[PDB]
Design a protein around this ligand. Structure first.
Ligand SMILES: Nc1ncnc2c1[nH]c(=O)n2[C@@H]1O[C@H](COP(=O)(O)OP(=O)(O)OP(=O)(O)O)[C@@H](O)[C@H]1O
Length: 154
């Protein structure tokens, strides 16, 4: 019972781009760019499309960095999130009614205003490591249990 999602982090040597979600589930947090994979599109195609829709950026080269499964107690569907990274983009980030982009220096990542699971795997992403993770949440603020392991192949 899992649904496919993508998450894209535009990570450059000195900075990372995040977007403040304006509405819906998880509004008020800085997150990567992503969403549900559509019928007839590959996971990577879905990741490229979501980055454009949510940030206005065009990505050519994408790299798989992680796979994270999110469980929300009381919600039947698991989120099967395929995480990707790019340092190679075109365009300028665009603010829309749904999302506000902002660049962050790597030592100023706003963890207090991000999903709690980011504090576990973002440090791996910054050190160019690949990972498989699982987080079980109660509501939007509490991690009940989790697992996280580094892998060589995502
Ligand atoms: N680290 C994280 N942990 C948990 N949830 C996260 C997360 N990062 C992140 O973006 N999310 C949530 O993941 C969800 C992604 O789904 P979404 O943005 O609503 O997209 P959709 O599948 O509806 O398609 P879209 O509207 O085209 O983007 C949102 O509810 C975000 O709050």
């Amino acid at each position: 019972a899992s649904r496919l999602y993508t998450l894209v982090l535009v990570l450059q040597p000195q900075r990372v781009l995040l977007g403040m979600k304006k509405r819906g589930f998880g509004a008020g947090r800085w997150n990567g760019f992503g969403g549900k994979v559509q019928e007839g599109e590959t996971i990577e195609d879905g990741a490229r499309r979501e980055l454009q829709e949510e940030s206005g950026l065009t990505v050519d080269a994408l790299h798989k960095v992680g796979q994270i499964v999110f469980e929300f107690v009381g919600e039947p569907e698991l989120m099967d999130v395929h995480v990707f990274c790019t340092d190679s983009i075109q365009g300028t980030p665009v603010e829309s009614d749904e999302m506000r982009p902002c660049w962050f220096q790597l030592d100023q990542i706003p963890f207090k205003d991000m999903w709690p699971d980011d504090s576990y795997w973002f440090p791996l992403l910054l050190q160019k490591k690949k990972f498989h993770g699982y987080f079980k949440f109660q509501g939007q603020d509490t991690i009940l249990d989790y697992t996280l392991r580094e892998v060589d192949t995502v």
